[PDB]
Amino acid sequence: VMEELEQGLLMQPWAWLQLAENSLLAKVFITKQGYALLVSDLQQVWHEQVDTSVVSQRAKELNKRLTAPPAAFLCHLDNLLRPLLKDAAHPSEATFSCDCVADALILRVRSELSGLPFYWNFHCMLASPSLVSQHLIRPLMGMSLALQCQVRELATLLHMKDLEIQDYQESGATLIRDRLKTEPFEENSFLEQFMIEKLPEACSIGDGKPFVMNLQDLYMAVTTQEVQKPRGLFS
Amino acid sequence: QVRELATLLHMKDLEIQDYQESGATLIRDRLKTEPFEENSFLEQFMIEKLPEACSIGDGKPFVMNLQDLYMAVTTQEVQVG
Numbered sequence: 001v002m003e004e005l006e007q008g009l010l011m012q013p014w015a016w017l018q019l020a021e022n023s024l025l026a027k028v029f030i031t032k033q034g035y036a037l038l039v040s041d042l043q044q045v046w047h048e049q050v051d052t053s054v055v056s057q058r059a060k061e062l063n064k065r066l067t068a069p070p071a072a073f074l075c076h077l078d079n080l081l082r083p084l085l086k087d088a089a090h091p092s093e094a095t096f097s098c099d100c101v102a103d104a105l106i107l108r109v110r111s112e113l114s115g116l117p118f119y120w121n122f123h124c125m126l127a128s129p130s131l132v133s134q135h136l137i138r139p140l141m142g143m144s145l146a147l148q149c150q151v152r153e154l155a156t157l158l159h160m161k162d163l164e165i166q167d168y169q170e171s172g173a174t175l176i177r178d179r180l181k182t183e184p185f186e187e188n189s190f191l192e193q194f195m196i197e198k199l200p201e202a203c204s205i206g207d208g209k210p211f212v213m214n215l216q217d218l219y220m221a222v223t224t225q226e227v228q229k230p231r232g233l234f235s
Numbered sequence: 236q237v238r239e240l241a242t243l244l245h246m247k248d249l250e251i252q253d254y255q256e257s258g259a260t261l262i263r264d265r266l267k268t269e270p271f272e273e274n275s276f277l278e279q280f281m282i283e284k285l286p287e288a289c290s291i292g293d294g295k296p297f298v299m300n301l302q303d304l305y306m307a308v309t310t311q312e313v314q315v316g
Contacts, residue, residue, distance in 0.1 A: 142289035144301050147237060149288040150280060154240035160268050161247045167266050168251070173259030180250045185243060194236060195307060203308045221281055222289045 001033060005049060009036040010134070010227055013220055015085030016212045019096035019107075023207035027135070028085060030078040032071050037122055038135060039105065042208055045132050046105045046124030062119040077120060080111050142222035143215060158185045244271045 008029035017024040017039075027038040034051040052070040059066060059073045068076075080094050093112040098105065107122040162184050175181070194202075205211070248270055261267065291297070 138291050141291050141297055144304075145291075145296055146285055146289045148300055149284060151236050151240065153276075153280065153284075154237060154244065157268075157271065158240065158244060158247070161244065161251070164251065164261075164266050164268050165247065165254075167261055167263055168254045168259055171259055171262060173254060173257050175250070175253050176257050177253055180246070180253055182243070182246055182250055190239075194239070199307055200311055203311055217281075221285060225286055225289055 001051075002049070005029060005031060005034055005036040007227065009038060010223055011220070013216050014212050016088060016209055017084070017096060018088075019098050022098060023209065024098065025208045025212065026085060028081050030074055030081065032074060035074060035077070037124060038127065038131070039107065039122075039124060040136075040208075042205065045127040045136070047127040047131050048122050048124040058121065062121060063117060066117075076113060076118065077109075080109065080118065080120075138226065139219055139222045142226070143218050146218055146222065155185070155187055241271075241273055 008031065009027060012027050012029050015026050015028070017026045023041070025040045025042070029036045034049065034055070036050075037048045039046050055070040055073060059068060059070070066073075083090050084092060084094060095110045097108040097110070099108075100106070103126060105122070105124040107124065109118075109120045109122075111118040165182075251268075
């Protein structure tokens with residue numbers, strides 16, 4: 001039960017949330033027996049795991065007149081959350097609000113469930129060091145190592161193509177188009193040029209949107225890897 | 236960096252295609268290189284080499300390989316504010 005929620009949350013991609021002119025990164029895994037949420041703003045991390053016991057009380061207190069068992073309420077919450085997290089700019093009637101008092105994060109979701117109120121309040125506490133390392137630190141290191149390996153493979157392929165170009169030039173032929181000539185690839189020169197020129201803009205984390213937009217498949221792959229007697233005449 | 240290397244590979248592929256169109260014949264047939272496809276390369280890499288490449292271990296690879304980029308990123312962050 002509890003382990004299933006943790007595994008599902010781990011094997012999930014990050015999503016971008018826009019609320020009150022603020023940007024958050026959210027991971028949500030909702031099942032028929034609870035849910036797991038992990039939110040961040042690139043400065044702090046909050047986590048919240050909920051079982052049906054607290055749902056039976058919160059869904060009533062927030063929605064006084066709502067008569068909904070935990071299963072239906074969780075299904076409605078998933079239908080509310082997944083469309084927004086999966087893709088952006090999707091029209092919806094859901095609204096998000098964020099607040100903090102002393103050390104906890106109250107995230108309020110207010111939605112129109114076919115023409116009726118739907119209020120939910122995530123009360124997320126600070127994530128323990130184990131959760132942060134499991135979800136952000138180690139996967140990012142794995143992604144960086146994988147990207148370095150990819151860069152090395154690309155450099156090897158470029159060297160092979162440069163050798164092919166050298167052989168073609170030695171053959172004595174000439175190009176019908178002379179504008180396509182490319183200088184030989186050098187790893188050190190390319191690295192120095194990149195660092196001097198484009199590293200500033202490339203490394204700009206911003207509000208986290210580039211991380212969600214670009215590096216998600218590799219992140220998911222890394223997370224999935226880490227989680228998994230003749231005688232006489234006859235003689 | 237990977238995107239730029241892919242762009243350079245595409246440019247070299249176009250150059251090789253033009254050379255072939257020019258009727259050129261290579262003396263060594265073993266030097267022929269297959270056209271580069273980003274999707275095929277990515278899928279092959281993820282299937283084959285990612286399991287052994289994305290091994291954190293005790294943290295030695297992190298300090299052995301990616302220290303310069305970390306310092307550059309930190310310096311840029313300090314410069315920004």
